Amino acid sequence: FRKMAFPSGKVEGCMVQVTCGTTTLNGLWLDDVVYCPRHVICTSEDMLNPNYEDLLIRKSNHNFLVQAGNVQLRVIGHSMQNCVLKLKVDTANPKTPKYKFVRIQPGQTFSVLACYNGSPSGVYQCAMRPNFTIKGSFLNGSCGSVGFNIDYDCVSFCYMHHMELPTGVHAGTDLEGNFYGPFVDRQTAQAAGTDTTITVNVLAWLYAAVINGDRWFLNRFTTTLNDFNLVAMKYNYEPLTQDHVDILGPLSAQTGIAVLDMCASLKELLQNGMRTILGSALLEDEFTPFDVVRQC
Amino acid sequence: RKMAFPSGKVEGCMVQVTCGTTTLNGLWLDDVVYCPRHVICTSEDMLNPNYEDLLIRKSNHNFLVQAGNVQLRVIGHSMQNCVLKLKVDTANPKTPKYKFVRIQPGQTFSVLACYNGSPSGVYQCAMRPNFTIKGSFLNGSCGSVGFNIDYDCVSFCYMHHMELPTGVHAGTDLEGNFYGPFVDRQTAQAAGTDTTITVNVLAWLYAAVINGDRWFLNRFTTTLNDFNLVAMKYNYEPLTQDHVDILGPLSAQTGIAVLDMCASLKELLQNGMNGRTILGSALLEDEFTPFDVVRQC
Ligand SMILES: Cc1cncc(-n2c(=O)nc(N3Cc4ccccc4C3)n(Cc3cc(F)c(F)c(F)c3)c2=O)c1
Ligand SMILES: Cc1cncc(-n2c(=O)nc(N3Cc4ccccc4C3)n(Cc3cc(F)c(F)c(F)c3)c2=O)c1
């Protein structure tokens, strides 16, 4: 049962390169605006303690170079919204998909188009971890790469990539430049807090295992939310809420395994351990309930 | 992380093909649509299809090709092995630079899973040694294609034909020749024993080292023959001298000789992981090639 990203085509045609002095990274071109990390206005020197207000006031249109493929776009306007730089350009993107900017919640999944020098290099499927980091595969030069979900023909942009934290995980904002998690866009000592496991996604993935005929961990027992939560907290698993239960309801119906029955399965796996489920030795938590229905 | 190639160049080629009551996906390149030839069958015909007999009874107007909203007009058709080629009157304007390649077991590629000619998702997989792929495919996915994109050229290597009893997948190159000994007929055919792709596992261990993971290394070396005698008792594929040569550059970059990495693998197979992890995995990963690792590292 595979991690599956959305087809990236609608986003590929919006990626550009943005250079400011000696700093280059990626930008998103929608209509006549290009969106990118505001830190592109900084030298490495500046990043120690940047004053973005001042750094921007001292800049103007001619300090920015935007390349769409080989064609240079001329910048005719610059502004900052939170941690995102918005450059107005002379040409509107004729490949602009229908889109919107949404902010996602921890535990939600999305696709990422890793790019280098404005060139798309690959796509993969992630989740917003409970500690507001993402376990992505960004290399140097990936800053400004976006994350998205597609619904019919409408792209929902939810992530812009800003940085790697010391532990190898990533940190970013929404497209309005609001960070996910307690991070700042300056070269200072920052760390992700203790991560937890996304309980409702694990349960979703057990449903997928049963659907695929992997049934060994089912048992005759059931649980309570409180007894389960006591176990959940013991193992660094997110609290399971009624909202969660309700959301799994469609998979509860389609397999005959109610959530507190499935919770009793998960309870036992936490304690005793496992052998394999869907070809995995670890309990997987980056598929949502919605994701399991889409793919199953 | 297993990354797929950006799918947009292929998305622009996907269409819906219908013949009578049967509908699957096709691939619109220039003025041709490629698709599985069993589009011309009913479920009844699938036990013992005579494709030559079924095809000669068809005319151009029997094939409904649909490109999003637009009906393409079929003006010719021929069969090449297990692929049907439908000549249409419009060249696909979104045709990318492309070629058709046939791949070998161990090679990776991206799949664009499509339904009714509509792309729904993209994933990365590999040709298993038993010539199946472990894909993610529902009913209606036939005609979905696998590809690599090496510098702006799309190399098509797979077209999806069928699911086998174990839930693995069988299909052709874009000249319509099947990977492995499978046939496009409902028969008792089954995937042989799946083995692990040793040379890929080694590649991924070299990746772990380059990302600063060394805990699984040991002080030992091995001969090639002793390595293979041992690995095959865990259903690992044999490592050939070619594999060893192929790993040469990763050997040089890290400073760890191939046979030392081999010794390390033997130890991992004996010990398991003792509750720890390698590039985030509690299993040994075999779906990254030497090329994929060099490319992304
Ligand atoms: C392996 C990896 C994975 N994801 C992201 C990065 N990453 C990167 O590619 N480039 C950065 N740069 C360039 C530059 C040019 C001029 C001035 C400053 C910088 C920093 N950074 C570091 C970075 C990003 C921030 F947003 C930030 F606030 C900070 F302090 C450092 C990468 O992390 C690296
Ligand atoms: C879960 C899954 C994953 N990948 C592929 C399939 N798959 C499918 O979607 N449809 C098939 N059909 C419809 C039809 C309409 C008219 C005539 C015949 C068929 C069979 N088949 C079965 C199949 C495909 C072959 F190529 C083949 F040679 C065979 F005998 C059976 C699917 O496997 C299923």
Author numbering:
A (entry chain A): 3 to 276, 279 to 300
B (entry chain B): 4 to 300
From the paper:
The SARS-CoV-2 3C-like protease (3CLpro), also known as main protease (Mpro) and nonstructural protein 5 (nsp5), is a promising drug target for COVID-19 therapy. 3CLpro is an essential enzyme for viral growth and is responsible for cleaving polypeptides pp1a/pp1ab. − 3CLpro has a characteristic catalytic dyad consisting of C145–H41, where H41 promotes deprotonation of the C145 thiol to generate a highly nucleophilic thiolate that undergoes proteolytic cleavage. Owing to these features, covalent inhibitors targeting C145 have garnered considerable attention in 3CLpro inhibitor research.
Compound 1 had moderate affinity for SARS-CoV-2 3CLpro (IC50 = 143 nM). Figure C shows the X-ray crystal structure of the SARS-CoV-2 3CLpro complex with compound 1. Similar to other inhibitors, compound 1 was bound to the active site of 3CLpro, and its core triazinandione moiety interacted with G143 and E166 via two carbonyl groups. The 3-methylpyridine group occupied the S1 pocket and formed a key hydrogen bond with H163, whereas the 3,4,5-trifluorobenzene moiety was bound to the S2 pocket, forming lipophilic interactions. The difference between compound 1 and ensitrelvir lies in the conformational changes observed in H41 and M49 side chains. In contrast, compound 1 did not impact the H41 conformation but induced an M49 conformational change around the isoindoline group. The conformation of the 3CLpro active site, especially the catalytic dyad of H41 and C145 bound to compound 1, was similar to that of other covalent peptide-mimetic inhibitors, such as nirmatrelvir. When designing covalent inhibitors, we hypothesized that the binding mode of compound 1 is more suitable than that of ensitrelvir because the conformation of the catalytic dyads in the 1 binding mode is similar to that of the native state, whereas H41 seems to have difficulty accessing C145 in the ensitrelvir binding mode. The crystal structure of compound 1 suggested that C145 was located near the 5-position nitrogen atom of the core triazinandione; therefore, we decided to pursue an approach extending the warhead from the core.
